[PDB]
Design a protein around this ligand. Sequence first.
Ligand SMILES: Nc1ncnc2c1ncn2[C@@H]1O[C@H](COP(=O)(O)OP(=O)(O)O)[C@@H](O)[C@H]1O
Ligand SMILES: [Mg+2]
Lengths: 172, 457, 464, 591, 55
Amino acid sequence: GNFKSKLKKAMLSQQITKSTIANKMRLKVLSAREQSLDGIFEETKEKLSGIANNRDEYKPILQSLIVEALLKLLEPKAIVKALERDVDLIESMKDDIMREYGEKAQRAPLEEIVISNDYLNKDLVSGGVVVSNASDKIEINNTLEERLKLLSEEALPAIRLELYGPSKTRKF
Amino acid sequence: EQGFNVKPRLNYNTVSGVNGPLVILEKVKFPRYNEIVNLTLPDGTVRQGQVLEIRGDRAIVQVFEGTSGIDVKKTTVEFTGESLRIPVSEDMLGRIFDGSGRPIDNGPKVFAEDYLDINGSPINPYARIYPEEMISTGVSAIDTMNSIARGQKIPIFSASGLPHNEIAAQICRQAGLVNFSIVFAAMGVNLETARFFKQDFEENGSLERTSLFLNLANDPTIERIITPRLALTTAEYLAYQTERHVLTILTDMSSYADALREVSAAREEVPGRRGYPGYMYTDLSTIYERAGRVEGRNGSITQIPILTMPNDDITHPIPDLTGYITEGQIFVDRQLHNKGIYPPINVLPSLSRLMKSAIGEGMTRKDHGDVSNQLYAKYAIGKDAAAMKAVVGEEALSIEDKLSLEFLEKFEKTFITQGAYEDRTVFESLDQAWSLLRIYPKEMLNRISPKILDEFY
Amino acid sequence: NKKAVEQGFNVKPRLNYNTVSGVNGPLVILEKVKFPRYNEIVNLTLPDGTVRQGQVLEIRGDRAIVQVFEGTSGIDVKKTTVEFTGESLRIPVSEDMLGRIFDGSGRPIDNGPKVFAEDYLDINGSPINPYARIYPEEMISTGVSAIDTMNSIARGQKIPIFSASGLPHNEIAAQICRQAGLVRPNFSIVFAAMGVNLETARFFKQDFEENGSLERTSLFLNLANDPTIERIITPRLALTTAEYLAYQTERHVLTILTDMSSYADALREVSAAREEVPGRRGYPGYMYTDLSTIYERAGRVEGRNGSITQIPILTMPNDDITHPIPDLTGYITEGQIFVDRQLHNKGIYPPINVLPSLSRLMKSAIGEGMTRKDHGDVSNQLYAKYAIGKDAAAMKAVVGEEALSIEDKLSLEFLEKFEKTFITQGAYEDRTVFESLDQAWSLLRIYPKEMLNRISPKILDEFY
Amino acid sequence: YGAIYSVSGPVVIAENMIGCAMYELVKVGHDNLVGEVIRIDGDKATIQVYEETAGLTVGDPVLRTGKPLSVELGPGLMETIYDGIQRPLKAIKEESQSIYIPRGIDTPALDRTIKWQFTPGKFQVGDHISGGDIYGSVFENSLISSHKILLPPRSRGTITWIAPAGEYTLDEKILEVEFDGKKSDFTLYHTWPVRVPRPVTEKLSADYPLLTGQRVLDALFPCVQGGTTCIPGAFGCGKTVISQSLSKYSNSDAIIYVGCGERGNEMAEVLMEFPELYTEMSGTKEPIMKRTTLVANTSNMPVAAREASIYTGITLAEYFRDQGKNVSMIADSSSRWAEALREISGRLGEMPADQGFPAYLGAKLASFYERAGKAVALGSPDRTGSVSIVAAVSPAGGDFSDPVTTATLGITQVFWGLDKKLAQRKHFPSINTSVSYSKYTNVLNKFYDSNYPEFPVLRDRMKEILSNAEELEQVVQLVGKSALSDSDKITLDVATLIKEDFLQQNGYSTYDAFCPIWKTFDMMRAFISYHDEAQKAVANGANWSKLADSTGDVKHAVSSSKFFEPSRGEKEVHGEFEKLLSTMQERFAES
Amino acid sequence: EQKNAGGVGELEKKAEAGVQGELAEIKKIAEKKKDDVVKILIETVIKPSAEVHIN
Ligand SMILES: Nc1ncnc2c1ncn2[C@@H]1O[C@H](COP(=O)(O)OP(=O)(O)O)[C@@H](O)[C@H]1O
Ligand SMILES: [Mg+2]
């Protein structure tokens, strides 16, 4: 009985040795796609920083990001937190932003749009803004890095459909 | 081409209350019910949460990872704006995930094929197929006496200390028709049980087609609410959108319902029996009713929710309501386990609502249903006569009662008793059952039809 | 010398609050309080001039919920003036207490003067440091065979008496007090009556007078007609007096807490008055904590020659030990003495059932030096053979006497000669531990040497 | 610094306290009572103060410490007694010169005056060091030698400076780590939050048995080193003496004796007895107290501190597991921990759930028992410690239907059910063989095949004998013993012999204080061989009454096998048992 | 049986040989579709989505 149990144990330990080798090789393939995926977002982050450095096509983008965050807050006052580079642009387009919020929200225009003395991290944030509550409680991290993170979380099935063909074993 | 859309989320930092497992916000802008939020602790670690209730501005959020360490001033709650969507894929099979769906197998985050809501959508009853395809579980007490049809929500009722884990692992190992994908959902089980299930699947070669959602006793307790829904939406994906045959093995649904009671008790709601939420029937129905076959699909979800009766009591709310929703049960008996019978399945409280459809008339064999009825009748007579002989002595027991006592002994000892790794085909189990029934004279066998009795005795 | 009394010469004026916001049950919700203490005992003055003491149980912002011991009947919101003392309930303790009779609230009902306080100690006390404890290893020869040979009381033990309504629990505890003495060479009893009737209180007082103990006993009588809320503080006052006497004056104090069933009943009534957890059988979920704060005040401490021995007399509501009061008391205390109705109706005195009884301090205080070397083995063998006798009696009642084996017949004979000779004593017959051990060895000599499987071979060879 | 708003028993709602985290520790009152935040309702922060609450006024300050309840780990605890919040009771007594626990006393958890002999580890300057790595060892006492000084978990980096060999106290720096340019200074100790379990590399399936010393516990229902255990029973059943007899005579390299809701006299007995007891481990007779630290929370101490005592004890056990010692933590009453939780919940006003126990009681018990387990320590060098949690549940009324008992049975693997019927009549240990079980029976087959191959077969035979006798006695109590066959007579007689000699083990007698595994195995061999010889001789045709009358000598020799002193040694005792079997076969052959 | 159990390293190398086949396809697909995926991601990130809540 001990020999039979040892044979069964050796037979059972034989399958595990093949199973562990199979799982490790299958996870290497899965981690290859995630490594290829991260290369896309790493290349996308570099391209996003290029859009911020244009300073000519960034102003239409930068104004849109504030209005997009302002329309979500839906309050007459806000505290825009932008990079130290963008403060001049924000102060230049404050009036246009207030008018756009007044027009896009079908409500009286923004009362005031304060630019916080505190600034975003230069290295961490490629561009964008972080529009916050008048009390600085409710904030919208509308930065380009945060938007890219949200896109990487959301559009992952679409990215898979773009890179690879539709799954062969997915009937419906 | 949907999904390519960015919607910035509202960080709040307006937490107003932490009452046990719940977190209350105070100034949410248009709060959405059953919404997922991402709490950012003062330490920097992120805990997910689900909006349980909403007021004009408040939003009671239940944190899945627990509320320990949640400050009121430096805790920021970010509203994702959508109910919990698990990223499912065909490559999700073969991986191990935490209670919240986060992989714990030292592998990459699952490369999403689609984002499926945990609650799913209620299948149209007109779109369901009646499950009439029996599964040969290898166990005699199940293949013969309470048959499981491919697409049945048949739980395992076992008290603490009983080998329900061993029985369910045996069923998973040997569950062919008279290959299955397994979606195992650990909820509050100990590391010993989790290691047992994982190692058994690895030894039997099931990891290639098993997705374990392990939520151990060490893991937080509010994640027991979320684990079975993730496992069942994974099973629904694999079985309806990829046309596989899935065997969902939710374990410790008693632990899940205890997590429900803890969540309900923090909300000061009107309680049910033993303090459980009044809507526990609804939650258990939402979880159990995610099993069966649909018309257009060639796939199935076989559900075997292991369930721990707190004190070996069927009348307890968890086993009661589950009996109500599920369609059967496999009652594991502490008395049988103490007697040493494996599997210690007590066939009297055990039941299978789909036996009458999946058994007999050419599906398995002409004698299956009659033999099962006769076995149940004789086992009940044996139990009653053994009680009568213990109370009022052996004189009260008649010849039929003595025969029933002998049959019960030879039935528990030789028919129910079956060591693990022993595959008893339904035909072999029926032959053994007939050998057990030949103890009785042909006349005394009551429920057996005359034709079957003449053809088989 | 003693600088503690130096701070005594200080006057602390007390705020008189007329702001009784509301009254409900035993509680008064009193608002506009200036920094309420959590456990201050207030002197509540009724409109009729009556003064009832009460202690705050909960304190919100400028709001204190006072529970009054005498009860809230007659309390008014316009006229009742509440005078916050600013300190917890402190009992004036002195060596002059020994020989006096006190009410449930600590006031003297002995028709004598108020206690000339030597110190004021909080009745709730403080937990004794477990490192400061000394394990009680000094056996007390109470003169009762069932309590000295089968069980054994060491000096700082907590050893209650579990009994029912009609059993002679008072008589047995009175026998222990009048016979208690160190086995290998006096106790200053402190008696706490909670909810007992006048007959029981007079019985205990007259027994102390007869035995000559009243010169060294303090009686805290809370009769059945006394307020129920102060049955909570009566054992606290008695045990604070005992703690003072023992640990400071270096005395050995017996503490008799009669009707801890009544104490637990008052506790349950107070808990149910509030919206508190029902525990089991309605008793509060913290009843273990309260009964422990009562019981665990007994014992011996390191560096001090005093000790406290507790014998809480407990009335079992339905003669079952699974009731919450007996169960929690058995969990907390270091044993129990079980007075049995099945033996009282049989006519045995003391009607102590040995099987349910227990003394957790028998291992220590039983040995070759503290007592005779055979004590532990003899006690274990007597327990085993008594249980065999009970089983043989049941089997005889079932299947007649003939079916019993030789061992069963011997065990029935031992059961008869044990209940009728060993357990049974006179009300004033005190048996030395060696006398009771000789009787026990006779009862074991009923058996052959082979069947005495509990006794160690050396003990059996040297004593059989 | 907040202010107290509401006080009701052990809970204290404190106002003007914005910024308090969950389960953080606050110093409530002027005496700095240790507390823990349970709820944060706006600026209010409900606090469970771990000390006596009487005397707290509205408006008293409440300092926010900023850290959770942190047990202070390091050299020093070995032979100490703690107060649930890890306040050394000896130091408290010496500092206060009283017999009581002062309110708000702030004595250090680990004595700082003591100088420790630190010997540097394999790690040198420049070597990357991670959490749990042993960068040095200190000699604590003769029994716990080379108390490995572990780097705190969650701390990593390169060693900028490591102190050389010498004598250091706990305040002195021992090692300096630079991580991300920020130098971190490390000493002999480090604090770890009790709520968060100490990390390990990988928990393992426990295979080596925890030798309790009790015959029934070792044989019938064994427990492995690293397995959760449970001892339910009424009062007087023996669940405290089993715990003490397991903390004295087990093979565990260390003991964490935790008393929650227990008598102070019990812990005083431990203090008086353990120094006088000695263990043969480490190659010398060192006192037991040199390897057991105590977390004493007497039943009259503050209610809220019982959870703190449980968590402090389990974190000490996890720390010694991380050092690599097969520790076994012994909670005196998880039942009283549950009662403390129920009291706190009821004071909070939470929903009663079952019997008043809060609905999270099962989850907390499951987490605490999941803290156990044999595990490879987090850092290098490789080592495999264990924490064998053996907690004595104390169900109310002696009924195993209590919610705490049911949850503990769900989470644990060994169930040492105590029967009060056997607790009476001095049948100790009072283990109820019918309901008790051990799920480590199968996993111990490797150890048994290695050391005592026939041991599982013998325990199966003993279980069969006991179950058969239970059934036969249930029959006999109703239908008399006359109708039984001779085989049934033998079964009942040998099972009475087993219950009265083998299973019952007096824990205070010299011979049966510690019955080791080899003596237990030999005793099982003797009893099973006696049963088999009686069965065979009666099957040959001998009348059982005359056979018993003849072989009473052999029966009494078997019944006297208890008295063989284990102090005589493994060889001498085995020689006495070998002659017993030879003297048994000859007597049965003669008759 | 132990002698027959030998060869795990050879089995691991054989399994890695099959994995190396799919990695080349993964890299080729990534290199081919990187431009398109990055262009879509950039357009989506910088695209304006100014809109108030429906309620
Ligand atoms: N194995 C044993 N050997 C000797 N005496 C025992 C044993 N078990 C219990 N006892 C006796 O029972 C008494 C109470 O047991 P204890 O440890 O207090 O159990 P519990 O804590 O459950 O009440 C002890 O004082 C001891 O004298
Ligand atoms: Mg105890």
